[PDB]
Chains A and B, each alone.
Chain A
Amino acid sequence: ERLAWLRDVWAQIDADYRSGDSARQETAAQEISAALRGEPNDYMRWVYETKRELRFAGPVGRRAIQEELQAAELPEVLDEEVNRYHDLKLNMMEIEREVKA
């Protein structure tokens, strides 16, 4: 199921690439380069964060989240992935770089 969802996502990427528009070609090219170099996708991080927020949200807030995301093609994410991402320790070198910048 995840592979089918990712195939649809990369179909969107391919549509952006093979289109002919300069901006779409450039953004598809940079996405492809990031994927080939293994750079993580910010979308997956957002999905994990919003899943944990939905898990720990109250009735009204979680209902609002569910009704707003009922139509978005979000991946089927097990709670184990969210737990792993949340329990991953933060990168102090990246924190230092960000604060210095």
Chain B
Amino acid sequence: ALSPYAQALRHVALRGATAFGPGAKEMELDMLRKGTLPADYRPPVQGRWDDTIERWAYAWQFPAEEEQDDITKSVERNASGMQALLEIGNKLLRSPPSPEPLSGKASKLYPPVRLRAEELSAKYNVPMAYIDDSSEASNASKSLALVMEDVGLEFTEDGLTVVISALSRQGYGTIGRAIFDFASAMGLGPSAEMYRALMKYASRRGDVNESMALIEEMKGNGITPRIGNWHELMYTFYKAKDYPAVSQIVDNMKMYANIEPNEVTFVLQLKALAKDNSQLNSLPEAIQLFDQMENVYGFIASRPHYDAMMFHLSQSPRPEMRLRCEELAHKMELMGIVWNANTYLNLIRSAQVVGDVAAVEKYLSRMREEGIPASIGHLTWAVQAHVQSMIRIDYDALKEKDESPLPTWLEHLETCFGIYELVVRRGWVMQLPFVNALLRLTCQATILSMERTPDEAETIGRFEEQANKIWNHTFDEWQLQKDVYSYECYIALLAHQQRIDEAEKLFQEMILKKDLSPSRRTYHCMIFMHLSSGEEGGTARALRYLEAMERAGIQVRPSLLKKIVRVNNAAGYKRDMKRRARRIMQAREEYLARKEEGRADVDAEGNSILEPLAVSPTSTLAWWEKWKRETVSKHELFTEEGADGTPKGETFEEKNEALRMMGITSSFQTKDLVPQPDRQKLLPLIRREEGEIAGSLWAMDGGELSYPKDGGGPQGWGVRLWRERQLVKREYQKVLDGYRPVPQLSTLGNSVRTAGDQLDIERSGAQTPGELSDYRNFPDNRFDGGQLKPESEAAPAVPFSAELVWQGEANDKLSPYKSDEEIALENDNTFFSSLRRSKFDYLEKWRDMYRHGTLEVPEGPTLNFGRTPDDHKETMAALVRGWYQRNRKE
């Protein structure tokens, strides 16, 4: 991951002065001319035939031109023609002409520039629009024809279709319909293409009712709805966010309309399935449809097909789907379809869904090298990649290693904030998804902090403060409007904070005030919040949300149902604790009210009865009895109960206070002081495979012993110890392979070691064989007493090779997001990096400078590695002079 400038620098550093000399083929030509070309080398014998061969070989990746010459787009860009068409349409709408012969000159609206016209048209099969009778309608038609000719369209059905499509794309539906009606009345037949041009206006806006009315009108006018009309209907439903309707229209078109789908139909279906969420099999349906198009129909996938399929596949975190997306991209580049912004966006999406910041940065660097300028969406999905990586952090392994994830969280947050600073410095207009990604990052950071470090309240407060600041200030600083995704993120944060009042307040504000449709993620968050809340009616409110989803059409998933069941079963604990707390408070009140209010060996008949002898006063059972009888009552341990419906005493502070009131000093003051037997890696394996290694851990009185038999045989001590030693050997093999840390020094190991080893271990105080190795290999770090110094005392040398451009860019942490111009200005800011900007452009410029003598390049490889063990030393030796020249001041 390097910028093209640093890549060119590393190229020259690796190739020395040979890079700017003749190429490999030039050297081969020189050798062939000299006659000393080696036999194994292919000789450049015939220039023309070699050129033809190389061109034939290169032709297979040659990209076919997919440029479309859109006449509609040309009409739209023609501003003067647009206003002429608009004024003509306004005239035709407000004051429609009249089919009278001598009205053109009488009417000032359409100034001019026997035999019946209708009879002539009927006899000669000609439209009434081509007849000049000095009529008002004739003048209007002539003006329209002149305007269309000026724009570049003939006054015919195709030209009318083009102009109506151009109008409809830029709104003006009424004007387009007026022009369509005028053409129909002037005899230019209202073809299905003209009806599609009309339908474009409704399709862009998404008016399903208008599109269906247009279809019905076309049917009633005796005109069969064609494949283009059905495509426009499908696009109308897609823009109206009814995606299964597209598939339904496709099925009905195949069955009843009997129209064979084309590549455009397949692209529309793929888009609809990509954005569809009504059924869980949308991705398998899209994959099967793509295979059907490839094999049965015999079509060849184009850029729209590949983009739609990659966009759909970059939505699932499954590695199989990610591999499919990568294979599709590779096939696209092999088939002569050069990658572009959408392709890189799809790749970044596929990487970010699984949380590969390295892959995202590699994609960004490759895009920068290939010269495709990064857009705002790529940075947004890079931020999303950071969010997903923070989610995917292995917190279990971090806890096992006793490592705080806070530095990693801070690193991710500062990287994303640096990206935001770069965006605001570049002058780009701030997009809503970028701020939404930042808000999601802050909310997820707060949630992860709460889930992983519940005791460190300071970082949780900082994360919540950042999230609140973003939500309250950034959206209206950049004049942006909060959307469903931003509401989803903030409501998820509130739900995890268990602020149900504020969460529902935001939810109903979003529904009623701003008229937004909450996402399925928002519904899931609300349901899970209410299920986790132990208060009465929580599951009732959760079912209310679920039935709201059902009656609003939100997808209900078996994963959602399973998680509902699991979360309800889990929150049963909190529900029970609250229910017990209610009776605890009642009992405390009754106890306070009671406080305010204020023969052993002879039976009833008088006979002497047996009595058990007194137990030993020193017995632990007697101690427990006396402690129970003499300690404070359970009602006076805590006066006020917990903050949220639960009894006090769950926190360690409250537990220690209660034990102190009961007269017991808790040895486990902190949570970490508990042994935490879930971290054991060796004992659980032995218990799982062989048996209870302890044996006498659970013994009442000479019973419940897990020990081998006395006799021996297959179930004896020898076999038991042999199997245990085999398991320990397996664990030691893992340690040697590096899957486990090297163990410390044991008493048995020390007693086994040689006398010198024991002596140096004792005199150094080393706890590990690694510490022993350090003590033996660094004699200078020994105290005069023989003890080894702490590791912090030693400071290793810092080679200057880390100051190289590529070395400093490797750990930049912001270079992949930085544009190449920014990096060039940051590093050089001179004519040496002035120059599109690419590694080969830099190489050409530097070669010209070398040939003109304005650049000094040392002959031989400046950067050396991979061939000799002492290669970094030679690199430093060759770079010392340059480092000193760079660092000295004159």
Contact = CB atoms under 8 A, between A and B. Distances in A.
Instruction: Determine direct contact between A and B, CB below 8 Å.
Output: yes
B804 interface: yes
A24 to B, nearest CB: 7
A30 to B, nearest CB: 11
Contact of A55 (B738, B861, B866, B867): B738
A31 B794 contact: no
A11 B777 CA distance: 37
A57 B770 contact: yes
A12 B770 contact: no
Given A15-B860, A71-B801, A58 B865 contact: no
B226 interface: no
B15 A14 contact: yes
A75 B798 CA distance: 20
* Most chain B beta-carbon contacts within 10 A, residue among A11, A57, A62, A70: A11
Contacts of A41: 867
B791 A75 contact: no
B859 interface: yes
Contacts of A56: 742, 769-770, 773
A41 B868 CA distance: 9
Contacts of B742: 56
Given A12-B14, A19-B18, A68 B797 contact: yes
A58 B797 contact: no
Given A8-B14, A58-B770, A61-B778, A15 B19 contact: yes
B774 interface: yes
Interface string B18-45: 1101001001000000000000000000
A68 B799 contact: yes
Contacts of B738: 55, 79, 83
A60 B861 contact: no
A40 to B, nearest CB: 13
Contacts of A16: 860-861
Nearest to A70: B802
A15 B14 contact: yes
Contacts of B875: 72
A79 B861 CA distance: 30
B777 A61 contact: yes
Contacts of B768: 58
Nearest to A66: B796
A71 B770 contact: no
A12 B866 contact: yes
A59 B17 CA distance: 42
Contact of A61 (B15, B770, B802, B864): B770
A72 B801 CA distance: 8
A69 interface: yes
Contact of B867 (A43, A61, A68, A83): A43
Contacts of B798: 67
A5 interface: yes
B667 to A, nearest CB: 32
A67 B796 contact: yes
Contacts of B24: 18
Contacts of B866: 5-6, 8-9, 12, 43, 73, 75
Contacts of A74: 865
A13 B771 CA distance: 40
B774 A58 contact: yes
A11 B797 contact: no
Interface in A1-54: 5-6, 8-9, 11-16, 18-19, 21, 24, 31, 41-43, 46
B872 interface: yes
A4 B772 CA distance: 39
B739 to A, nearest CB: 8
A26 to B, nearest CB: 14
Given A15-B14, A15-B19, A67-B798, A59 B774 contact: yes
Contact of B872 (A42, A61, A71): A71
Interface string A65-92: 0011111111100010001000000000
Nearest to A45: B869
A3 B807 CA distance: 19
Nearest to B876: A71
User: How many B residues are at the interface, by size bracket?
Assistant: 35 or more
B283 to A, nearest CB: 30
A68 to B, nearest CB: 7
Nearest to B19: A15
Contacts of A63: 791, 794, 796
A24 B861 CA distance: 10
B645 interface: no
A15 B768 CA distance: 47
A62 B738 CA distance: 15
A15 B802 contact: no
Contacts of B773: 56-58, 61
Contacts of A67: 796-798
A41 B799 CA distance: 26
Given A43-B866, A60-B791, A71-B872, A15 B16 contact: yes
B707 to A, nearest CB: 37
A38 B24 CA distance: 24
Contacts of A59: 770-771, 774, 791
Contact of B807 (A13, A55, A71, A83): A71
Contacts of B16: 15, 19
Contacts of A42: 868-869
* Most chain B beta-carbon contacts within 10 A, residue among A6, A9, A21: A9
B863 interface: yes
A61 B24 CA distance: 45
A8 B860 CA distance: 14
Interface in B857-890: 859-861, 863-869, 871-872, 875
Contacts of B15: 11-12, 14-15
Nearest to B768: A58
* Most chain B beta-carbon contacts within 10 A, residue among A15, A70, A79, A83: A15
Interface string B376-419: 00000000000000000000000000000000000000000000
B784 interface: no
A2 B772 CA distance: 35
A67 B869 CA distance: 16
23 contacts: A9-B867, A15-B18, A18-B27, A19-B859, A42-B869, A58-B768, A59-B791, A60-B781, A60-B791, A61-B773, A61-B774, A62-B770, A63-B791, A64-B794, A67-B798, A71-B799, A71-B872, A72-B801, A72-B865, A75-B866, A79-B737, A79-B738, A83-B737
Interface of A: 5-6, 8-9, 11-16, 18-19, 21, 24, 31, 41-43, 46, 55-64, 67-75, 79, 83
Return the 9 tightest CB-CB contacts between A and B, nearest first: A58-B770, A9-B866, A71-B801, A72-B872, A58-B774, A73-B865, A67-B796, A60-B774, A46-B869
